[PDB]
Design a protein around this ligand. Structure first.
Ligand SMILES: NC(=O)c1cnc(Nc2ccc3c(c2)CC(=O)N3)cc1NCc1ccccc1
Length: 282
């Protein structure tokens, strides 16, 4: 890819400025894995991820990348195994995460239904490619669907991804998005489909998967509220959009509801998901 040299990265991220971008700093975000900073490497704006158990998820991401190169996956430009810390250099996504755009973080406009259908279709192509190449993401969520200049969906965080049903003791991912069997230890591509279903619900509603001050706290519980005839998806539609037509909204929910099949084998495969998502627009 490119070994970069820790000192070039330290330099281009203003000595890894802890100050947020908001105040003119370099810190973009965090996560248990490490801090992500904005850098400037030869006119190119980059995203530099500086990393409980000490070099795992590093060589994992490096291996999953190189293997995986699709227009719906974030591209890794380099790494840095020298100096003082383990860094990874990805392409800077100017339109941040889908979670950010759905929540209108930092006064951005609300995504239209048109944009949301491109984002769903695109993210499905990315999962498709990953599954075609026998990889299971294990953390499909809206925070992990990044958006470029043209609002193309790019799937991120492959440090947990596994080559493909096997059970495990170290259970990882984001609950609220996690499939019931994934919460039990089952490593399966079917879990990725379930987690995508939660993302479609987030796209439709504009509601985050989990909200402690909301009833229900878990967004997947609204699927039960809808199915138990109490309400309709039309009552949950993101009011922050002028172009969401009930016919395609119901079509997305139909897909989301199929993904959110509690029984792993009853869920559609990513290819079925892609063709139903294509159908919705065409
Ligand atoms: N506009 C933005 O805020 C923004 C710009 N560029 C990004 N690049 C990027 C690409 C691949 C990967 C990562 C970041 C982290 C990783 O693991 N892979 C991510 C962004 N937001 C989401 C974001 C995610 C994590 C931390 C801070 C921020």
């Amino acid at each position: 890819f490119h070994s970069f040299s820790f000192y070039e990265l330290k330099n281009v991220t203003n000595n890894f400025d802890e100050r947020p971008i908001s105040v003119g700093g370099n810190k973009m975000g965090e996560g248990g894995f490490g801090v992500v900073y904005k850098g400037y490497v030869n006119n190119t704006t980059v995203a530099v991820k500086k990393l409980i158990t000490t070099k795992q998820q590093f060589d994992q991401e490096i291996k999953v990348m190189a293997k995986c190169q699709h227009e719906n996956l974030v591209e890794l430009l380099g790494f840095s195994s020298d100096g003082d810390d383990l860094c990874l250099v990805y392409v800077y996504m100017p339109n941040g995460s889908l979670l950010d755009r759905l929540s209108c973080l930092d006064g951005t406009p609300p995504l239209s239904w048109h944009m949301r259908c491109k984002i769903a279709q695109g993210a499905a192509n990315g999962i498709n490619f990953l599954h075609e190449n026998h990889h299971i993401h294990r953390d499909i969520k809206s925070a992990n669907i990044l958006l470029d200049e043209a609002f193309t969906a790019k799937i991120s965080d492959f440090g947990l991804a596994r080559a493909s049903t096997v059970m495990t003791s170290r259970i990882v991912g984001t609950t609220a998005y996690m499939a019931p069997e994934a919460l039990r230890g089952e490593i399966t591509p079917k879990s990725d489909i379930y987690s995508f279903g939660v993302v479609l619900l987030e796209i439709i509603t504009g509601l985050p998967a989990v909200d402690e001050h909301r009833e229900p706290q878990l967004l997947l519980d609204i699927k039960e509220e809808i199915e138990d005839e109490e309400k309709t998806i039309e009552d949950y539609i993101d009011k922050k959009m002028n172009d969401a037509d009930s016919t395609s909204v119901e079509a997305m929910y139909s897909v989301a509801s199929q993904c959110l099949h509690e029984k792993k084998n009853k869920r559609p495969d990513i290819k079925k998901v892609q063709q139903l998502l294509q159908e919705m627009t065409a």
